[PDB]
């Protein structure tokens, strides 16, 4: 399904300043990576 959130296995959270890092459910890690589905 199309979905209305972050890419499958990914979720985006910003820091206290305002820069958004990604928490990857795929490998389970909070880091700066581009989604599995890069779009």
UniProtKB/Swiss-Prot annotation:
Tissue-by-tissue expression: Ubiquitously expressed. Expression is highest in lung, kidney and brain.
Biased composition (Basic and acidic residues): 10-19
Signal peptide: none
Domain WW intervals: 4-37
Location(s) in or outside the cell: Cytoplasm; Nucleus; Cell membrane
Annotated spans, Disordered: 3-39
Extra facts: A cysteine residue is required for ubiquitin-thioester formation.
Subunit field text: Interacts with UBE2D2. Binds, in vitro, through the WW2 and WW3 domains, to neural isoforms of ENAH that contain the PPSY motif. Interacts with BEAN1, LITAF, RNF11, WBP1, WBP2, PMEPAI, NDFIP1, and PRRG2. Interacts (via C2 domain) with GRB10 (via SH2 domain). Interacts SCNN1A, SCNN1B and SCNN1G; regulates the activity of the epithelial Na(+) channel (ENaC) through ubiquitination, degradation and intracellular retention. Interacts with ERBB4. Interacts with NDFIP1 and NDFIP2; this interaction activates the E3 ubiquitin-protein ligase and may induce its recruitment to exosomes.
Domain commentary: WW domains are involved in recognizing PPxY motifs in substrate proteins. The WW domains mediate interaction with LITAF, RNF11, WBP1, WBP2, PMEPAI, NDFIP1 and PRRG2.
Role of this protein: E3 ubiquitin-protein ligase which accepts ubiquitin from an E2 ubiquitin-conjugating enzyme in the form of a thioester and then directly transfers the ubiquitin to targeted substrates. Specifically ubiquitinates 'Lys-63' in target proteins. Monoubiquitinates IGF1R at multiple sites, thus leading to receptor internalization and degradation in lysosomes. Ubiquitinates FGFR1, leading to receptor internalization and degradation in lysosomes. Promotes ubiquitination of RAPGEF2. Involved in the pathway leading to the degradation of VEGFR-2/KDFR, independently of its ubiquitin-ligase activity.
The name this protein goes by in its record: E3 ubiquitin-protein ligase NEDD4
Organism the protein comes from: Rattus norvegicus
């Amino acid at each position: 399904g199309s979905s209305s959130g972050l890419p499958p296995g990914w979720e985006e959270k910003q820091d206290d300043r305002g820069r958004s890092y990604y928490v990857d459910h795929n490998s389970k890690t909070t880091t700066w990576s581009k989604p599995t589905m890069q779009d």
